[PDB]
């Protein structure tokens, strides 16, 4: 029951030997999951706070683990004042580890008791302490309370600014201290002041770690506080082109990818032009891959429509579509596919066949090596094939023709993926049945001796695309299919799935 279990846990708590006490304390959250009754939760947390107050630091650490795990059941605490009052008493202990565990406790309880001003004062006083563990615990609790309280955030932003600008604060503590600022999204002037501070940080502390941490937390802050998003985008592009460090450029790429994933509509034509200039200019294929991933993400959205005939984006995507590296080629041809399926200008008519032959080249490139990266690039290219045949249906005959001519020579995994692509294309337009049906059928003969692993899935996919191609009755062809199944499958699950597709 509930009461019985709580009594057993309290008996374990009073045991006075540390092993049973720790066992009982860490047993508490499972009890909460068993019986989420608010009277039980309140009484149990009261007992936990009481053992927290009087008990060695390892027991307090177990209690901290419980409170971190049972964050949702904190909402069902009624005697909040008494609970926090006896948790808070151990902040006066002269033992810095006890203070550290207490600060982390208050950080775990920031959700239920923000705006408890004595707790704020404890975070603020413990921030400038001497013990390193106490300062880190104060930093963690400050992060939580800044996420919760607006008053605490505005009160602590000045302390953090003077702490970074302070000189007795070492570099690693500064590094841990910066990303408190990502929680200054409660107010416009608060966010603007935090932005000013972050600009001062990157100019005055130009080390790789500190610029990375600062410009990444500035990105998150501007992401939450939507007013600062365009200047954040232009700062990231500026750092991508100017800062020579590969780590800084990689961060600029990753967090611009974050911004393009969440607010693509706020991207301007100037930002996309600047990013395209960066991509054309860079000699490093990893950077080119990264910002081309950003470009493909943008091109998936409406940002291309906002971007708009020939331009640096188009020149980029044509140039990178035939790149030696497979990933750059995959992303560039995805960009081409998105631009082609978006607009219907008269210059785009020349662009579509460029895209088609790019997809052709990707099939020739990625259909042999069978590497997992090859599977990724092949999936990107085939999804692009499906996209521009569905969106530009007058261009599907050539797509299917190159798929047919390539299906003979591709490996088994590439055959599975191309059969899936071809099945999608065939499902979306019916005017190509008998011919391509015969070619896939003459392909079907040689499937009995391909391999041992992918043979079954290849048979399923090939029979599926055979059925999609077909629109009539077949007798000798069904005899060939059945003979193949009896000869090589002898499994049934493949036969059942093939029969499912036939139905």
């Amino acid at each position: 029951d509930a009461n019985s279990a709580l009594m057993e846990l309290d008996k374990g708590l009073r045991s006075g030997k540390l092993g049973e006490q720790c066992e009982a304390v860490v047993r508490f959250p499972r009890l909460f999951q068993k019986y989420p009754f608010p009277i039980l939760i309140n009484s149990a947390f009261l007992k936990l706070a009481d053992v927290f107050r009087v008990g060695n630091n390892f027991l307090r650490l177990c209690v901290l683990k419980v409170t971190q795990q049972s964050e949702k059941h904190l909402e069902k605490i009624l005697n909040v004042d008494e609970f926090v009052k006896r948790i808070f008493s151990v902040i006066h202990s002269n033992d810095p580890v006890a203070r550290a565990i207490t600060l982390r406790m208050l950080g775990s309880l920031a959700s239920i008791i923000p705006e408890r001003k004595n707790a704020h004062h404890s975070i603020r006083q413990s921030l400038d302490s001497h013990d390193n563990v106490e300062v880190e615990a104060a930093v963690f609790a400050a992060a939580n309370f800044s996420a919760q309280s607006k008053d605490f955030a505005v009160g602590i932003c000045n302390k953090i600014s003077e702490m970074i600008q302070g000189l007795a604060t070492p570099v690693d503590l500064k590094l841990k201290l910066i990303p408190i600022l990502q929680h200054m999204h409660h107010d416009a002037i608060l966010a603007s002041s935090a932005r000013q501070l972050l600009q001062q940080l990157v100019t005055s502390y130009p080390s790789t770690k500190m610029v990375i941490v600062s410009l990444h937390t500035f990105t998150l802050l501007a992401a939450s506080s939507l007013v600062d998003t365009p200047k954040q985008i232009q700062l990231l592009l500026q750092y991508l082109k100017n800062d020579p460090r590969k780590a800084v450029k990689r961060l600029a790429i990753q967090d611009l990818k974050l911004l393009a994933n969440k607010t693509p509509h706020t991207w301007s034509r100037e930002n996309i032009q600047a990013l395209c200039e960066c991509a054309l200019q860079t000699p490093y294929d990893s950077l080119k891959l990264g910002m081309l991933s950003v470009l493909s993400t943008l091109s998936g959205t409406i940002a291309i429509k906002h971007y708009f005939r020939s331009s640096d984006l188009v020149k980029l995507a044509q140039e990178c579509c035939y790149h030696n590296n497979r990933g750059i080629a995959a992303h560039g041809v995805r960009v081409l596919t998105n631009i082609t399926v978006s607009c219907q200008e008269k210059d785009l008519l020349a662009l579509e066949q460029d895209a088609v032959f790019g997809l052709e080249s990707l099939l020739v490139l990625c259909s042999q090596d069978d590497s997992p990266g090859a599977q990724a690039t092949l999936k990107i290219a085939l999804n692009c094939m499906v996209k521009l045949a569905k969106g530009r249906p007058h261009l599907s005959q050539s797509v299917v023709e190159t798929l047919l001519t390539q299906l003979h020579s591709a490996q088994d995994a590439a055959r599975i993926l191309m059969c899936h692509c071809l099945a999608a294309i065939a499902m979306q337009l019916p005017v190509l049945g008998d011919g391509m049906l015969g070619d896939l059928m003459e392909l079907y003969k040689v499937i009995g001796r391909s391999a041992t692993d992918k043979q079954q899935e290849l048979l399923v996919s090939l029979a599926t695309v055979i059925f999609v191609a077909s629109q009539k009755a077949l007798s000798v062809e069904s005899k060939a299919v059945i003979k193949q199944q009896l000869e090589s499958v002898s499994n049934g699950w493949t036969v059942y799935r093939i029969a499912r597709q036939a139905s």
Binding site: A376, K379, I380, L382, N383, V386, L417, H420, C421, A423, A424, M427, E457, V460, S461, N491, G492, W493, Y496, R497, R500, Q501
Partner: peptide, 28 residues
């Protein structure tokens, strides 16, 4: 994540109880 055939019946690797039981009972 990325998928070629959006509507593919073989996509689901771990299936419901009916198809799992039918698979184990016929994959031999």
């Amino acid at each position: 994540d990325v998928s070629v055939w959006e509507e593919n019946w073989e996509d689901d690797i771990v299936q419901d109880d009916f198809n799992q039981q039918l698979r184990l009972e016929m994959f031999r």
